[PDB]
Amino acid sequence: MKVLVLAFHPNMEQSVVNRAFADTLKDAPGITLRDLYQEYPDEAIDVEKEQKLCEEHDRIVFQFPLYWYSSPPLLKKWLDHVLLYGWAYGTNGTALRGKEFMVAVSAGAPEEAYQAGGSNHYAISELLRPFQATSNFIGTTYLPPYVFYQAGTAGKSELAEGATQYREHVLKSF
Ligand SMILES: Cc1cc2nc3c(=O)[nH]c(=O)nc-3n(C[C@H](O)[C@H](O)[C@H](O)COP(=O)(O)O)c2cc1C
């Protein structure tokens, strides 16, 4: 029901794919969409603010483009700075236990590339393992990701169908 979408794109105005995906949620009740590079242009994160928002939602969605098979660096900094002892883990660290955790990621390469025998050799499930392990450690339930391939070169209509598929997935109950 209550879904926090944390979008991590260095320039959401120049973005093509993630911008389109984000647009489909600007009116869905229950959705809190945020543009983190926009809110923290100097990457100085308000830890308590972030923590408090996670607390108030039932599902947390990390949305980003696939950059070198990982995320943009602000998400990495977000994990490091926000997920603290006594909050996310550790003795009292139980604030996220029970909440849902999912990744929505767009990739330039085709789906064919992400498999054994394909040009990138590994399935997306393999590449996203740091995020799944993060989920595992902090007590959240790891949901299947939303993945969009051929991002940027897939075509006008394909992108539109991709966007509507993104919306259904993010709102889907599992
Ligand atoms: C620095 C950088 C690294 C990238 N690394 C990958 C990658 O490892 N695998 C891949 O499929 N695409 C990669 N891409 C292409 C992006 O995934 C693609 O631009 C993005 O998913 C969708 O773009 P948009 O939301 O900004 O429109 C990379 C792009 C940039 C700029």
How does DSSP assign the chain, residue by residue?
Answer: --EEEEE--TTTTT-SHHHHHHHTTSS-TTEEEEEHHHH-TT----HHHHHHHHHH-SEEEEEEE-BTTB--HHHHHHHHHHS-BTTTBSSS--TTTT-EEEEEEE-SS-GGGSSTTSTT-S-HHHHTHHHHHHHHHHT-EEPPPEEE-STTSS-HHHHHHHHHHHHHHHH---
Q: Which is nearest to 165 in space by CA: 3, 17, 10, 12?
A: 17
For this experimental structure, what is the resolution in angstroms?
2.5
**Residue identifier of the C-alpha nearest atom 28 of ligand 1:** 67
- Residue closest via CA to ligand 1's atom 20 equals 65
Establish whether 67 is an annotated binding residue.
no
Number of domains in the chain: 1
Which ligand 1 atom is nearest residue 151's CA?
22
Quote the CA–CA distance of 137 and 139 in Å, as a whole number. Answer: 6
* Residue that has been written with the tokens 């966007």 in this structure: 163
Q: What is the CATH number of the domain that holds 146?
A: 3.40.50.360
Distance of CA 150 from the midpoint of ligand 1 (Å): 9
Best mutation site among 5, 21, 67 for ligand 1 pocket (most ligand atoms within 8 Å of CB): 67
R_g (Cα) of the chain, nearest Å:
16
Q: Which residue type, as a one-letter code, is found at position 129? A: R
Mutate to test the pocket of ligand 1, among 9, 11, 66, 120 (most ligand atoms within 8 A of CB): 66
d(CA 59, CA 166): 15
Q: Would you say 7 and 23 are in contact if contact means Cβ atoms under 8 Å apart?
A: no
Which residues, judged by CB distance below 6 Å to any ligand atom, belong to the binding site of ligand 1? 9, 15-18, 65-69, 106-109, 151-152
Tell me the residue range of the domain where 55 lies: 1-174
Task: Report which of 82, 68, 69, 80 is spatially closest to residue 34, judged by C-alpha positions.
Answer: 82
Name the one residue in this structure whose structure tokens are 């992108």: 159
Determined by X-ray
Token pair for 44: 């100085």
Please tell me the residue having the least CA distance from ligand 1 atom 31: 67
- Asked if residue 78 belongs to a known ligand binding site, the reply is no
At residue 101, φ and ψ (nearest 5 deg) are -135, 120
Q: Whose CA is nearest to atom 3 of ligand 1?
A: 67
Residue nearest to ligand 1 atom 2, measured at CA: 67
